[PDB]
Amino acid sequence: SKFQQVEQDVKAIEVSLSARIGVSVLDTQNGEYWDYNGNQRFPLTSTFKTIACAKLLYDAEQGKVNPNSTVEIKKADLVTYSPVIEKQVGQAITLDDACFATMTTSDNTAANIILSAVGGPKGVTDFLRQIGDKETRLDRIEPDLNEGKLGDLRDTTTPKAIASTLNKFLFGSALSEMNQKKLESWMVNNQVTGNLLRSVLPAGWNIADKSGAGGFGARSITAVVWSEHQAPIIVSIYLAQTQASMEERNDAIVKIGHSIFDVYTS
Question: Could you give the CA distance from residue 220 to residue 211 in angstroms, rounded to a whole number?
């Protein structure tokens, strides 16, 4: 009953937005976990970016690639919504800076640059299987991976799978302490999620997050929140196949986030 209010809020949104919605909350401080449709499939959309950049750091540690190596930006590589890369045509960008761009602004060309350096969708999926994520899969690059059609298994995850994977990336030991901090900082420095969980974050708390939006109303956020008195809590919220406006989907995330935070501030 601890998450009773959260469950009620999710059920109300499910009805009002006639949507498929799933949530997973993992509390690393006491091993507690809760979910609603946590095993259901939803489109990753931009939430996959965190995994691709985690792989860049992991591959760098193994010596498979140099994160400081540069990649030439050609006008033909540009895809929809690439604020950082669109200003660097004809120039070279380091893989590390491409990850900074895609993690903090969600720049899509930057994400494709990272994917090309870490083995594409296939390399990313293989990496996920190695860390123990049996569900999440990446199959296409930007912009096609955002299609979000019902029943399509391509580019999907479950709320529980991605929350677990983020827990492992940031707090397990697959990545070095230095790289965990680097990945976490990229998420903390996200500039495009001010209207989601950040807008209801409790005073004194911290947050590292990455959100996404896509076809058929897909909307999501994967976040890690903590404070001086609360160890990391991983929150995964996904909506799919809804006609709801972006404002209504943001409203759903803010209401659910608020209730989740109340579980831990009350």
Answer: 5
- Give the resolution to one decimal, in Å: 1.8
Question: CA–CA separation, 250 vs 222, rounded Å?
Answer: 14
The DSSP symbol for 29 reads T
What are phi and psi for residue 96, nearest 5 degrees?
-60, -45
Residues with a catalytic annotation lie at: 46
Nearest to 79 by CA among 52, 116, 129: 116
Q: How was this structure determined?
A: X-ray
Write out the DSSP string of 54-113.
Answer: HHHHHHHHTTS--TT-EEE--GGG--SS-TTGGG-TTSEEEHHHHHHHHHHH--HHHHHH
Reading phi first (left if > 0) and then psi (alpha if -120 to 50, else beta), residue 208 is in: beta
Q: In this structure, what are the phi and psi dihedrals at residue 64, rounded to the nearest 5 degrees?
A: -75, -25
Q: Which domains does the chain have, with CATH numbers?
A: 1-266 (3.40.710.10)
Which tokens sit at 182?
A: 């680097």
